[PDB]
Structure formats: C-alpha cells, structure tokens
Amino acid sequence: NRTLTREQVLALAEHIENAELNVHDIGKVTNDFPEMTFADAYDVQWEIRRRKEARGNKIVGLKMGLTSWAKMAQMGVETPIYGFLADYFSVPDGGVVDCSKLIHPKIEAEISVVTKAPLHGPGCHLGDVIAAIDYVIPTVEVIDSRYENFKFDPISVVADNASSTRFITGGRMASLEEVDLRTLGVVMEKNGEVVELGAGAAVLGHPLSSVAMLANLLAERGEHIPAGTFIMTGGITAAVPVAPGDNITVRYQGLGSVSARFI
Ligand SMILES: O=C(O)CCCC(=O)C(=O)O
C-alpha cells in the first residue's frame, strides 16, 4: 500500500513543509508521483510532524477535515482526513493574524474538544468517546493549502497536513454535559455581516463521531489519541476567504464568540 521510497518521503516532507514556512504555493505532489497512496501521504505528513518536533515545536493537537457536507462539497472531496496542530499555529481570542505569512487563507468555524482519557481504535464508536471528553472549545480554523488556487486531490492535501496553518480559540470553554454539540448553532460574521452559519450536526451527524473516526484512522498506523489531546472536529460550514483589513466574529450558541482581525 506504499509506492514512495524512504528518500522520497523525507524529501517530499521538506519540499511541502518549505512551502508553508516560506509562504509560497507548489504543484500538487501527485503530479510528480501519480501512484502515491494515502499511506504514502500520511508518511509524508508524519515526517513533517517529526521535522517540527525535532526543531522544538510542541504538537498541541489534532484536526479532522472534510467531515461536513459543506466542506466536502466546497473542496470536491468526500474522504475525511486528519492532520496535526503545531504550537505556533495558535492565535488568542481577539488576536491579530499576519496574512503576510499566509498564501491564500480561509476561515472555518469549528467546535473542539479536549480529552481526559486515551482513545483507541479500531472499532471506536460514539459511545466510547463520550466519557473521554473533558470540555469543549469554540475554535476558528485558518486553513491555507500550499497548493495553487487552493485546488487539491485528497492525497496531496493529506501530505500538506490537511492545509493547517492557524487556529483561534475563544468564547466559553465548558464541560460536555452542559453543551449539546449536535444542536450547537454557529454564526460566522465577516466585516460586520453574517456570511455563513450551521450546526454541529454537520460534522458527521455529531462532532463526537468525528473524534471516534479520528481514533479509527490513527489506529491504521498503530497510533491513538492520548489523554489531554486538543481535537478540532471539523468545519461546520464552508470556508470563507480572509485578507488584510478583515475582522471576523463567530458566535456560538450559548458559548459566546470567537473573534480575530487580519493584517
Ligand atoms: O479544506 C481543506 O483545504 C482541507 C482542510 C479541511 C478542514 O480543516 C475542515 O474541513 O475542517
């Protein structure tokens, strides 16, 4: 289920990571490696993770992508994927994001969880996840594919760490029993007006199903979700482009709001 040589995995990881670190797009890597598999692509992603760890970055969480109809439709792919979150991705509520470090960024409204017990696949179900949730965190992702025109096939996107680049936490961060993640309403405002909205159920029917799916995907590589992991469960709505001068506010039903501005 692999077609890359080890040398190619290491070199592709450097190439793709450099596009992020040096703020430029690249061609879809499947153009040069058309036989590349998902296992190849995740090898590349985890090697990028290793590069970041080796230079001292902490990995502060994981994200699930392409979990909602809206995001599947927008990106043309219907296969859920995951990627990792590095510490310097983090942005404080109300913070300023420097777009000069970004290529062609978009924002997504999500709900995140922090776990308090390990989760393992395979065969992880919704009922296995519930007690492992410590609390929930309103989170806006900034995604920024390193591929030109934000156009990819899923294998390329996995290799590019599922387009991850920034995330903004905010609002009220409460216990799971206090928050219905299925019916949680989310309203995205940009420059003072509503531009997107949705409910948590858009994420695979229930955001906690995304957590179960992540455990199952990780198990394919012998990995799991350690206790204390921050997980972004997926874009509830279509992603919206942002640019210098923009301000955004995402309102979470009963949980306040997350805001940011861009320069
Ligand atoms: O859309 C992309 O470029 C991939 C990132 C997907 C994602 O983070 C989400 O659906 O929440």
Ligand SMILES: [Mg+2]
């Ligand atoms: Mg996302």
